[PDB]
Design a protein around this motif. Structure first.
Motif, short mmCIF file in Angstrom:
data_model
loop_
_atom_site.label_atom_id
_atom_site.label_comp_id
_atom_site.label_asym_id
_atom_site.label_seq_id
_atom_site.Cartn_x
_atom_site.Cartn_y
_atom_site.Cartn_z
N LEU A 1 -5.34 -2.18 19.41
CA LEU A 1 -5.76 -1.64 18.01
C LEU A 1 -4.54 -1.25 17.52
O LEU A 1 -3.52 -1.26 18.24
N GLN A 2 -4.53 -1.29 16.13
CA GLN A 2 -3.21 -1.14 15.39
C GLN A 2 -3.07 0.67 15.19
O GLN A 2 -4.41 1.26 14.85
N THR A 3 -1.91 1.00 15.23
CA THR A 3 -1.97 2.75 15.35
C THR A 3 -1.10 3.08 14.20
O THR A 3 -1.30 4.10 13.54
N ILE A 4 0.18 2.36 13.88
CA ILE A 4 1.06 2.74 13.05
C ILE A 4 1.37 1.61 12.08
O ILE A 4 1.31 0.50 12.51
N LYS A 5 1.66 2.02 10.69
CA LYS A 5 2.20 1.04 9.85
C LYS A 5 3.28 1.46 9.02
O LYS A 5 3.00 2.64 8.23
N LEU A 6 4.24 1.04 8.67
CA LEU A 6 5.13 1.08 7.76
C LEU A 6 5.27 0.24 6.78
O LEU A 6 5.37 -1.02 6.68
N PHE A 7 5.47 0.84 5.59
CA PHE A 7 5.42 0.19 4.03
C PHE A 7 6.92 0.15 3.68
O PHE A 7 7.71 1.04 3.74
N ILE B 1 -5.56 -2.81 -1.22
CA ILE B 1 -4.04 -2.96 -0.49
C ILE B 1 -4.30 -3.12 0.81
O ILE B 1 -3.65 -3.81 1.80
N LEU B 2 -5.19 -2.11 1.32
CA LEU B 2 -5.44 -2.14 2.66
C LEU B 2 -6.02 -3.26 3.19
O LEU B 2 -6.12 -3.76 4.44
N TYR B 3 -6.99 -3.54 2.60
CA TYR B 3 -7.99 -4.86 2.64
C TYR B 3 -7.05 -6.25 3.02
O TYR B 3 -7.18 -6.97 3.88
N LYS C 1 -4.98 -6.60 9.37
CA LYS C 1 -5.57 -7.79 10.29
C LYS C 1 -7.10 -7.24 10.60
O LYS C 1 -7.13 -6.37 11.27
N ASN C 2 -7.72 -8.31 10.54
CA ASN C 2 -9.10 -8.23 11.14
C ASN C 2 -10.02 -6.94 10.54
O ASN C 2 -10.89 -6.54 11.32
N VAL C 3 -9.35 -6.64 9.46
CA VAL C 3 -10.36 -5.38 8.94
C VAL C 3 -11.66 -6.09 8.52
O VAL C 3 -11.80 -6.72 7.79
N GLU C 4 -12.54 -5.20 8.89
CA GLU C 4 -14.11 -5.48 8.47
C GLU C 4 -14.70 -4.49 7.47
O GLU C 4 -15.40 -4.98 6.56
N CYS C 5 -14.32 -3.32 7.73
CA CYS C 5 -14.73 -2.36 6.62
C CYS C 5 -13.55 -1.21 6.47
O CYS C 5 -12.91 -0.91 7.31
N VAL C 6 -13.42 -0.75 5.12
CA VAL C 6 -12.85 0.57 5.01
C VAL C 6 -13.40 1.62 4.34
O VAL C 6 -13.98 1.58 3.12
N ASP C 7 -13.14 2.82 4.78
CA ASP C 7 -13.73 4.15 4.09
C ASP C 7 -12.71 5.06 3.85
O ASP C 7 -11.69 5.36 4.82
N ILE C 8 -12.63 5.58 2.67
CA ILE C 8 -11.56 6.50 2.23
C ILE C 8 -12.20 7.76 1.58
O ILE C 8 -12.99 7.78 0.96
N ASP C 9 -11.66 8.87 2.28
CA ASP C 9 -11.98 10.21 1.70
C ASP C 9 -11.61 10.41 0.28
O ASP C 9 -10.63 9.91 -0.09
N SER C 10 -12.53 11.07 -0.32
CA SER C 10 -12.35 11.15 -1.61
C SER C 10 -11.18 12.28 -2.16
O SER C 10 -10.36 11.85 -3.00
N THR C 11 -11.15 13.22 -1.25
CA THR C 11 -9.99 14.29 -1.58
C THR C 11 -8.65 13.50 -1.30
O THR C 11 -8.51 12.94 -0.34
N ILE C 12 -7.62 13.99 -1.98
CA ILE C 12 -6.15 13.53 -1.80
C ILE C 12 -5.22 14.73 -1.87
O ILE C 12 -5.49 15.74 -2.67
N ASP D 1 -7.01 10.34 3.97
CA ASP D 1 -7.71 10.15 5.19
C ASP D 1 -8.49 8.91 4.89
O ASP D 1 -9.34 8.87 4.17
N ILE D 2 -8.14 7.66 5.71
CA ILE D 2 -8.85 6.64 5.56
C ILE D 2 -9.27 6.22 6.93
O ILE D 2 -8.77 6.07 8.17
N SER D 3 -10.72 5.76 7.13
CA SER D 3 -11.26 5.22 8.44
C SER D 3 -11.74 3.74 8.20
O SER D 3 -12.13 3.43 6.95
N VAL D 4 -11.15 3.20 9.24
CA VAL D 4 -11.32 1.63 8.99
C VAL D 4 -11.84 1.08 10.19
O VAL D 4 -11.85 2.00 11.51
N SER D 5 -12.38 -0.06 10.27
CA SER D 5 -13.41 -0.70 11.45
C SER D 5 -12.54 -2.14 11.67
O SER D 5 -12.03 -2.57 10.55
N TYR D 6 -12.51 -2.81 12.85
CA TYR D 6 -11.86 -4.03 13.09
C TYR D 6 -13.02 -4.68 13.63
O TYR D 6 -13.96 -4.36 14.25
N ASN D 7 -12.64 -5.99 13.89
CA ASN D 7 -13.55 -7.08 14.65
C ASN D 7 -12.69 -7.75 15.60
O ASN D 7 -12.66 -7.77 17.06
#
Lengths: 161, 161
Positions: free
Chosen positions: A9-15, A56-58, A62-73, A155-161
């Motif tokens: 699983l991916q833990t950290i990402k640097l942009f 952008i996250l999609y 890598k191997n991203v199957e779904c992305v859920d993003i919380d409304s509040t920022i 806060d962003i919830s993602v799923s992988y395959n």
């Protein structure tokens, strides 16, 4: 620069340059804030920035199957203060192909200090750019020396395959 | 702890429970040292260590075509009162899917301090475990202050698909 776990699983990402125009959009959105060190705006009206972040996250994962993003920022300001190691109460996921991350976008990069330190048994990481890190890990907001520091956190919830 | 660049080429590997099977053998190998700060022992009639290293790298590295191990071992011990500096290594591979690494296996860990710290314009990584990093990065050996820190260094060359 991206960091994976031993399981896979991916833990950290640097942009580096991924969040360019949405930086200006977030600046414009944050212009309507009056003296708040940490202000949360629920964002379901102008979902254009949320759609751009989701796309952008999609594309840049890598191997991203779904992305859920919380409304509040949330938006956070920092001055020459102390802060400490704000740990997370060991948020343990349920499945094995799902992970919830916190994404931080820098609106005003501090001249000195203001680095998000991340603690892991295998090694620490200190960075000054936009970050996406697991809620499992324990992070610290190091003190600044010169200049201010503004961050936008989502806060962003993602799923992988 | 996998680390990859923007091209997809693995750069830094953090092994936690990987080399704690041949570490005793490396300790026996190190015994033949006579007051050398950094001894580059040409090791040829010990190819069992090479074979186990190659097996571990083949098993736990993804998308591997060939691992070219070098037949020398460099033992370096860092005195508590001895300091270091940067390295400023300038080296770029001439092919696409290929990279030369540096495998550091800890033989005598320190009580505190003197972790290996790696530089990059988008983050710095401090670690005190089994590390494997590319030759394109500038690295630093921090000032040890308690005990001793004796490490073993190999020279790796991996070509992927």
């Amino acid at each position: 620069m991206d960091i994976y776990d031993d399981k896979g699983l991916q833990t950290i990402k640097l942009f580096n340059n991924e969040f360019d125009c949405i930086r200006n959009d977030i600046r414009e959105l944050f212009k309507h804030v009056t003296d708040s060190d940490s202000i949360q705006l629920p964002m379901e009206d102008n979902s254009d920035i949320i759609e751009n972040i989701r796309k952008i996250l999609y594309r840049r994962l890598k191997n991203v199957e779904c992305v859920d993003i919380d409304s509040t920022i949330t938006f956070m300001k920092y001055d020459p203060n102390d802060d400490n190691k704000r740990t997370c109460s060991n948020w343990v996921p349920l499945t094995n192909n799902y992970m919830e991350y916190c994404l931080v976008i820098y609106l005003e990069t501090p001249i000195c200090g203001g680095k998000i330190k991340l603690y892991h048994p295998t090694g620490n990481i200190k960075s000054d750019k936009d970050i996406m890190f697991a809620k499992t890990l324990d992070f610290k907001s190091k003190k600044v020396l010169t200049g201010r520091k503004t961050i936008a956190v989502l806060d962003i919830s993602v799923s992988y395959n």
